[PDB]
């Protein structure tokens, strides 16, 4: 077959009931995740190949970066609760990996302040029980699939994308193969 288990995707041995339709895991410490955001725009390109209104979910993970990795999962919960993901994704990636100016929870907060989120608004979300629950949701979703690596995509709780089985001589072709595989899996 053109799409084969083990080539473009793998199949979870223990599928996850009630998982999001399209679920991405990433870390701001993750070098491939940086590339998936700024160089390849994987999420944008996957979204353009799926029907309108399809739910794409993106969660941060704890297992990269120690204390700061957990702070970043909480900050992503804040970004999700406030709806400011598109405002902070690039400054957070570049603060961690390009300029290396993010070293503390206060440095993360500065990114949100510079992006126009009010200090009281950020701090109130950071300490909120809604954010505590969003943190739990992200942890539970990664636990459900026993996640050991990022960037990762899962489709319908059953299929995991396999980007290493994909051609990387051309960045544009790679993105297209990845996006077309998600479409195929979403229709499976
Ligand atoms: O090097 C590869 O075979 C595929 C790949 C990955 C990747 C590999 C493993 C897990 C997640 C992603 O990221 C890339 C980014 C850019 Br630009 C170009 C290629 C890749």
Tokens of 11: 């199949």
Resolution in A: 1.9
Question: Does residue 35's CB lie within 6 angstroms of at least one atom of ligand 1?
Answer: yes
* 186 CB-near residues (< 8 Å, 6+ apart): 21, 22, 50, 54, 155, 156
DSSP code of residue 170? S
CA 145 to chain centre: 14
Identify the helix (H) or strand (E) that includes residue 120.
helix 119-126
Question: Does residue 151's CB lie within 6 angstroms of at least one atom of ligand 1?
Answer: yes
Spatial contact of 161 and 11, defined as CB atoms under 8 Å apart: no
Q: Is 180 exposed, middle or buried (0-12, 13-18, 19+ CB in 10 A)?
A: middle
Tokens of 52: 């309108």
CA 153 to chain centre: 8
How many CB atoms are closer than 10 A to CB 29? 21
* Residue 25 CA to ligand 1 centre (angstroms): 14
How many CB atoms are closer than 10 A to CB 73? 23
Spatial contact of 31 and 180, defined as CB atoms under 8 Å apart: no
Using DSSP bridges, classify how beta strands 22-26 and 56-60 pair: parallel, antiparallel or unpaired.
Answer: parallel
* Residue 117 CA to ligand 1 centre (angstroms): 33
Tokens of 92: 């957070």
């Amino acid at each position: 077959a053109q799409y084969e288990d083990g080539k473009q995707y793998t199949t979870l041995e223990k599928p996850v009931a009630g998982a999001p339709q399209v679920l991405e895991f990433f870390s701001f410490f993750c070098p491939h995740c940086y590339q998936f955001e700024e160089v390849l725009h994987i999420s944008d390109n996957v979204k353009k190949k799926l029907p309108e209104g399809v739910k794409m979910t993106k969660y941060h993970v704890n297992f990269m970066g120690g204390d700061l990795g957990k702070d970043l999962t909480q900050a992503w919960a804040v970004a999700m609760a406030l709806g400011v993901e598109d405002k902070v994704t690039v400054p957070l990636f570049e603060g961690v990996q390009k300029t290396q100016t993010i070293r503390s929870a206060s440095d993360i907060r500065d990114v949100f302040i510079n992006a126009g989120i009010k200090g009281e608004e950020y701090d109130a979300a950071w300490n909120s029980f809604v954010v505590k629950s969003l943190v739990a949701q992200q942890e539970k979703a990664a636990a459900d699939v026993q996640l050991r690596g990022v960037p990762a995509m899962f489709v319908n709780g059953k299929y995991q994308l396999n980007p290493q089985g994909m051609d990387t001589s051309n960045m544009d072709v790679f993105v297209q193969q990845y996006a077309d595989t998600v479409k195929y899996l979403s229709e499976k």
